[PDB]
Design a protein around this nucleic acid. Structure first.
Lengths: 194, 49, 51, 247
RNA sequence: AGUAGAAACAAGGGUGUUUUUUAU
RNA sequence: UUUGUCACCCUGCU
């Protein structure tokens, strides 16, 4: 129950997650590990978005922190940390000007390097069978996709990746530590009323 | 309209998209974007949160 | 012709019975939500006016 | 940007921050209607009584930068008082005549297209021919007739679909249009409605009244068709009958 | 007085300011 | 009559 894991993450994670599961979910059974899925997801998305501003050209440079500087356009606006009335709103208001393909299902990010969306979800073990489901789901979602693994295997479409590849290892450490404590405690990788 | 969020969270969420998407993804002035983001941050601070 | 003193007779304790008959073989929350207006009607207290 | 300026000025003083950060967004539907005025039981008497008042109607405050105070002869055209529970000004019915007399002009190339369903009647009446009058019996049966041609074979769902796609494009929400007819209507209106300054409620109302079907219960004695019904007072009577073919 | 008819109208609310003083 | 000398607002379905 991640209220002890609350000592690890900034409270904004749970601030967003409890507000998100409010309408669709609860905290009666196995939510703090569903909170853990959500926290890994949101944390890695934010972790990218935190320090990438774009130059005249794409391929964002990593930037110092807390710095009022020339470039503020960060490459990836967060769509996952919003309510539907803003998520669908922003995906429409993008699909209209700078014409893209509003996808049949939900997005996570959108950049100005490739001018397309990104999917960043995670799966626990080998994705040899679940990349199939992901593929039959957001069919031809022509925004860069990249599944993940609770062990550390990475691969994506177009044989091309996002940006600097030390973040590869840093997300590997993110996940590695997460499980580490998981293995320490969890079994890591095992009607109306009136 | 629906949702369970406050009226200012929404009015500040749908105030940064407009600065970056019509007046800074179509080549209109880059000098208003600054103060737009400035006052958005100012407002989201004034609520004390 | 007409009927006389129509809304001086017809007390709620019969609306209760006809509602209980209408809502037969139905979920229970349905009946409970449908039978509260007859109950407050049969216990009502009318104001008098201005003086 | 006046938007964020007025927002920050609202949430800078007291009495206005707590309302904005306490009222959720699914609740503003209730407090939008929070009024201290009553719907009136006798409107005719009140109109006849109020028309003899000096300042009987209400305008938006912008009047003070669009219309003078005292005209050529020296009759007041608006007052210096605010209405009951609003920031609107109380104005006299001479200001309407003034605006229609010496006022700002605009263009009117779109008013025909937004109100097409009326101009249909207008230039369908002035292309119709008359005939004889038969003074005889009139036997009427009461039937159910469509009082509007019903542009498409659709219902309310795809109606809201096409209306929100044509009027409010960045807030359609989630779904996309499916069939060919709705796309054709959409794009026709897309092109022919560009650069319009009519209020979007008026455009949505006219598209609803122009695109959906209404049916009523009427006594007929002749032919059962939709273009005939709008002229029914004139074609049939109880003792006489006029002949007519609209164009 | 009159309106009016099973009870009313013939108006209804708030804000003031204050120990003898010479003059127009 | 009064401790007074005179003013002031508001409202017409609340």
């Amino acid at each position: 129950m991640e209220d002890f894991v609350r000592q690890c993450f900034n409270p904004m994670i749970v601030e967003l997650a409890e507000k998100a599961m409010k309408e669709y979910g609860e905290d009666l059974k196995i939510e703090t590990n569903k909170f853990a899925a959500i926290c890994t997801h949101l944390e890695v998305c934010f972790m990218y978005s935190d320090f990438h501003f774009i130059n005249e050209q794409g391929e964002s440079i990593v930037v110092e922190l807390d710095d009022p500087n020339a470039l503020l356009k960060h490459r990836f606006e967060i769509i996952e940390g919003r309510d539907r009335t803003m998520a669908w709103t922003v995906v429409n208001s993008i699909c209209n000007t700078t014409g893209a393909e509003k996808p049949k299902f939900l997005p996570d990010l959108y950049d100005y390097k490739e001018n397309r969306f990104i999917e960043i979800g995670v799966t626990r073990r080998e994705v040899h069978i679940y990349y199939l489901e992901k593929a039959n789901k957001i069919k031809s979602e022509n925004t860069h996709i990249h599944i993940f693994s609770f062990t550390g295997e990475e691969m994506a479409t177009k044989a091309d990746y996002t940006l600097d590849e030390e973040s590869r290892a840093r997300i590997k450490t993110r996940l590695f530590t997460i499980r580490q404590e998981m293995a320490n405690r969890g079994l890591w990788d095992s009607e109306e009323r009136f | 309209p629906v949702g369970i969020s406050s009226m200012v969270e929404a009015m500040v969420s749908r105030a940064r998209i407009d600065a970056r998407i019509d007046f800074e993804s179509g080549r209109i002035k880059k000098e208003e974007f600054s103060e737009i983001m400035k006052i958005c941050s100012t407002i989201e601070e004034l609520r004390r949160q | 012709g007409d009927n006389t003193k129509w809304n001086e007779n017809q007390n709620p304790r019969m609306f209760l019975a006809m509602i209980t008959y209408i809502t037969k073989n139905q979920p229970e929350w349905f009946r409970n939500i449908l039978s509260i207006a007859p109950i407050m009607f049969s216990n009502k207290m009318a104001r008098l006016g201005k003086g | 940007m006046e938007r964020i300026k007025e927002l920050r000025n609202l949430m800078s003083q007291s009495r206005t921050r707590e309302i904005l950060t306490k009222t959720t967004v699914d609740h503003m539907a209730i407090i939008k209607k929070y009024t201290s005025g009553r719907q009136e039981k006798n409107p005719s008497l009140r109109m006849k009584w109020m028309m003899a008042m000096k300042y009987p109607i209400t305008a938006d405050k912008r009047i003070t930068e669009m219309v003078p105070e005292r005209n050529e002869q020296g009759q007041t055209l608006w007052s210096k008082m605010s209405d009951a529970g609003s920031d609107r000004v109380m104005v006299s019915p001479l200001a309407v005549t003034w605006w229609n007399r010496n006022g700002p002009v605009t263009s009117t190339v779109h008013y025909p297209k937004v109100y097409k369903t009326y101009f249909d009647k207008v230039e369908r009446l002035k292309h119709g021919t008359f005939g004889p009058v038969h003074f005889r019996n009139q036997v009427k049966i009461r039937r159910r007739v469509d009082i509007n041609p019903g542009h498409a074979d659709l219902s309310a769902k795809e109606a809201q679909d096409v209306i929100m796609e044509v009027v409010f494009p960045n807030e359609v929400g989630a779904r996309i249009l499916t069939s060919e007819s709705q796309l054709t209507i959409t794009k026709e209106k897309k092109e022919e409605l560009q650069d319009c300054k009519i209020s979007p409620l008026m455009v949505a109302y006219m598209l609803e009244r122009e695109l959906v079907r209404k049916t009523r219960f009427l006594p007929v004695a002749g032919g059962t068709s939709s273009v005939y019904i709008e002229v029914l007072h004139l074609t049939q009577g109880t003792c006489w009958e006029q002949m007519y073919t609209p164009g």
